[PDB]
Coordinates of C-alpha atoms in Angstrom, one line a residue:
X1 CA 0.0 0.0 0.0
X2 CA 2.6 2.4 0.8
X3 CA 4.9 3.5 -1.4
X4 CA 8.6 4.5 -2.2
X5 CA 10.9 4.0 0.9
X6 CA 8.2 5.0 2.8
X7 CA 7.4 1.2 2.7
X8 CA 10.8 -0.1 4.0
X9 CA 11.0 3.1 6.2
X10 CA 10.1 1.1 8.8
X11 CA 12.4 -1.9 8.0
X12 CA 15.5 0.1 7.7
X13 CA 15.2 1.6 11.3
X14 CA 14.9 -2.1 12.4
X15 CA 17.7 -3.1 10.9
X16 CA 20.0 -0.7 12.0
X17 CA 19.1 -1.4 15.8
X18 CA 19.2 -5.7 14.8
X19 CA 22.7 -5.1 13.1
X20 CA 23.5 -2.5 15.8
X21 CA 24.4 -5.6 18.5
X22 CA 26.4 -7.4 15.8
X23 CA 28.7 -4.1 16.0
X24 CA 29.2 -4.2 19.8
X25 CA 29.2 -8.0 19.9
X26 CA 32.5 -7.8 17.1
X27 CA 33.7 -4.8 19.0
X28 CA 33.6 -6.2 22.7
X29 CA 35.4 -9.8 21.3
X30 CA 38.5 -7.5 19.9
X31 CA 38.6 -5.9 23.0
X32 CA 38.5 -9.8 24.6
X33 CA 35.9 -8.4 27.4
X34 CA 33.4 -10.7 28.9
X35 CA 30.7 -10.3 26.6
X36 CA 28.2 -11.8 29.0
X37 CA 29.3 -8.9 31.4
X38 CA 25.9 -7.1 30.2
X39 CA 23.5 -9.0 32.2
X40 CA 26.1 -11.9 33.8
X41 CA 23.4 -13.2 36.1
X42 CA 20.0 -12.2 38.3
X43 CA 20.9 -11.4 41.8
X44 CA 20.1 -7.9 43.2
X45 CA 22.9 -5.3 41.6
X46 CA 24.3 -6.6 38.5
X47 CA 28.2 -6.4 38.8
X48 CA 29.5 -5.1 35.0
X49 CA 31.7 -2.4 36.9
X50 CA 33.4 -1.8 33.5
X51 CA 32.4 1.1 32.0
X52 CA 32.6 -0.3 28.7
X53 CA 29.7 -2.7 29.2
X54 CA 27.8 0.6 30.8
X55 CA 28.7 2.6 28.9
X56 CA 28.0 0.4 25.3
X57 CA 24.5 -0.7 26.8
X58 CA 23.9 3.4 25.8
X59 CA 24.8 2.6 22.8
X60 CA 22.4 -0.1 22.1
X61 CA 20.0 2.1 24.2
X62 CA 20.4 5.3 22.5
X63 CA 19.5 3.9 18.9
X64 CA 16.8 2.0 20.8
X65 CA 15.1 5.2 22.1
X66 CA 14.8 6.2 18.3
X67 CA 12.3 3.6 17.4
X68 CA 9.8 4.4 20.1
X69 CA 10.3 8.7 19.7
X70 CA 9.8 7.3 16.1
X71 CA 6.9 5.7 16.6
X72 CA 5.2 8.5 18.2
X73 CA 6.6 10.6 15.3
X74 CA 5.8 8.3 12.7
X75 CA 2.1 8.3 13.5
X76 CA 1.8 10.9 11.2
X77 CA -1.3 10.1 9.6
X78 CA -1.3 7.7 6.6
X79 CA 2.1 8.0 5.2
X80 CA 3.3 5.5 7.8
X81 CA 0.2 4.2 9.1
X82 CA -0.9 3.1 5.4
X83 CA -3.5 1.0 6.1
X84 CA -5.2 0.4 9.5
X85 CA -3.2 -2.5 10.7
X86 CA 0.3 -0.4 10.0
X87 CA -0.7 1.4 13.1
X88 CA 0.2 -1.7 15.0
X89 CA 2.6 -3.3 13.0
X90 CA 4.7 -0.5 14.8
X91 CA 4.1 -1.4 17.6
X92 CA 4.1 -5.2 17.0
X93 CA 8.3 -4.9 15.6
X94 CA 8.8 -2.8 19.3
X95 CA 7.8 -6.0 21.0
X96 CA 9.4 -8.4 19.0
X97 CA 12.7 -6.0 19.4
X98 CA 12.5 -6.7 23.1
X99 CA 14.7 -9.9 23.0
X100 CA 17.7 -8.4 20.9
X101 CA 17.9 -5.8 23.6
X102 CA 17.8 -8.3 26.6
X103 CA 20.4 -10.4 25.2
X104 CA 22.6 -6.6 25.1
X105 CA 21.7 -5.5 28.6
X106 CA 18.3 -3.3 28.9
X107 CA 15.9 -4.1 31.7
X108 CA 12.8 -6.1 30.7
X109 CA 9.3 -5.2 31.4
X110 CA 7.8 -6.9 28.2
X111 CA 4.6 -7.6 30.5
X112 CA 3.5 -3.4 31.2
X113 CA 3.5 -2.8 27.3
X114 CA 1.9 -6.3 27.2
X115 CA -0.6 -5.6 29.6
X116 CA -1.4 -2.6 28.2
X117 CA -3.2 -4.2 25.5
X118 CA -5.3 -5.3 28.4
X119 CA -7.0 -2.3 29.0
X120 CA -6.2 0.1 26.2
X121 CA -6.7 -1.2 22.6
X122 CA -3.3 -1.8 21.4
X123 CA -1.6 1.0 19.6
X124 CA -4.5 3.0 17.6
X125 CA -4.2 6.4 16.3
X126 CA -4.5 7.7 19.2
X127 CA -3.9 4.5 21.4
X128 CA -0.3 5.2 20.4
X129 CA -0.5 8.8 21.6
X130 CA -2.0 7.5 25.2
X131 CA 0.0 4.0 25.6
X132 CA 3.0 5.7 25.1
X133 CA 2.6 6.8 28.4
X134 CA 3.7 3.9 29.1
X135 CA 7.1 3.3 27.1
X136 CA 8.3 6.8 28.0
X137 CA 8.2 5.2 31.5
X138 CA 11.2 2.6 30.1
X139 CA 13.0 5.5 28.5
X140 CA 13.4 7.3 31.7
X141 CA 14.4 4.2 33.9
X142 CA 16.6 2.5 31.5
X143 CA 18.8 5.6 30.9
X144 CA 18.3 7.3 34.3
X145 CA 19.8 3.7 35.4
X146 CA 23.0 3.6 33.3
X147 CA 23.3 7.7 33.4
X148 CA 24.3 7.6 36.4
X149 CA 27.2 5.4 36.1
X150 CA 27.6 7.0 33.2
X151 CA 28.6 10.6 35.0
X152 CA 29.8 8.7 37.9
X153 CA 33.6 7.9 36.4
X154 CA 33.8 11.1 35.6
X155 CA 33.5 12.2 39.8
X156 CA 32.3 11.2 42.6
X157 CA 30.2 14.0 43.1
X158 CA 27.7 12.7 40.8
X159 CA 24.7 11.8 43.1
X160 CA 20.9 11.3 42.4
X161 CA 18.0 9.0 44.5
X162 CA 16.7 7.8 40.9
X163 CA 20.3 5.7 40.6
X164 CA 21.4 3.8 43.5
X165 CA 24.9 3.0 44.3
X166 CA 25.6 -0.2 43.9

């Protein structure tokens, strides 16, 4: 239905984020670092005191944070949202996209965004504009998290309640 790029559009921002952990996955075996650093194993604070796997889980993040501002974005009206079912087939990439980023680092919460079917539709017109509520919510808390460390090499003096210390 749609036409030019505008059809792949959405297939070439998915792609970049799927190729994107390739990049880091080549780049953290030449620098012979413990890939499984980024989520190592569940108990309470997760070690990966390195600030490369920190500071590369950005990086994943970052690009990330561009396909759900995109989403928002893309809404337009009809370019993107051709026909009525392209209005979740945005949405329905965002949840499939959940694993690549779990196996980088990222905290899961598959089951809000889930659950938010539940209740509201699932990503309509405006279903978008009011889940996304929701997602935003992941924004703040998966970069607030790793911001901190971020800043934190940098001094000492870097201090917020949102970001605990270890």
């Amino acid at each position: 239905g749609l036409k030019g790029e505008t059809k792949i559009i959405l297939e070439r921002s998915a792609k970049d984020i799927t190729d994107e952990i390739n990049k880091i996955k080549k780049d953290a075996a030449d620098n012979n670092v413990n890939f499984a650093a980024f989520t190592d194993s569940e108990t309470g604070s997760k070690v990966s005191e390195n600030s490369f796997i920190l500071e590369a889980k950005v990086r994943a993040t970052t690009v990330a944070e561009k396909f759900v501002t995109a989403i928002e974005g893309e809404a337009t009206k009809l370019k993107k949202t051709g026909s009525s079912g392209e209005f979740s087939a945005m949405y329905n990439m965002m949840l499939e996209v959940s694993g690549p980023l779990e196996e980088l680092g990222v905290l899961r919460m598959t089951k809000t965004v889930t659950d938010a079917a539940e209740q509201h539709p699932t990503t309509t017109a405006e279903g978008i504009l009011e889940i996304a509520k929701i997602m935003k919510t992941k924004l703040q808390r998966v970069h607030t998290k790793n911001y901190c460390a971020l800043e934190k090499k940098k001094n000492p003096n870097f201090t917020d309640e949102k970001c605990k210390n270890n």
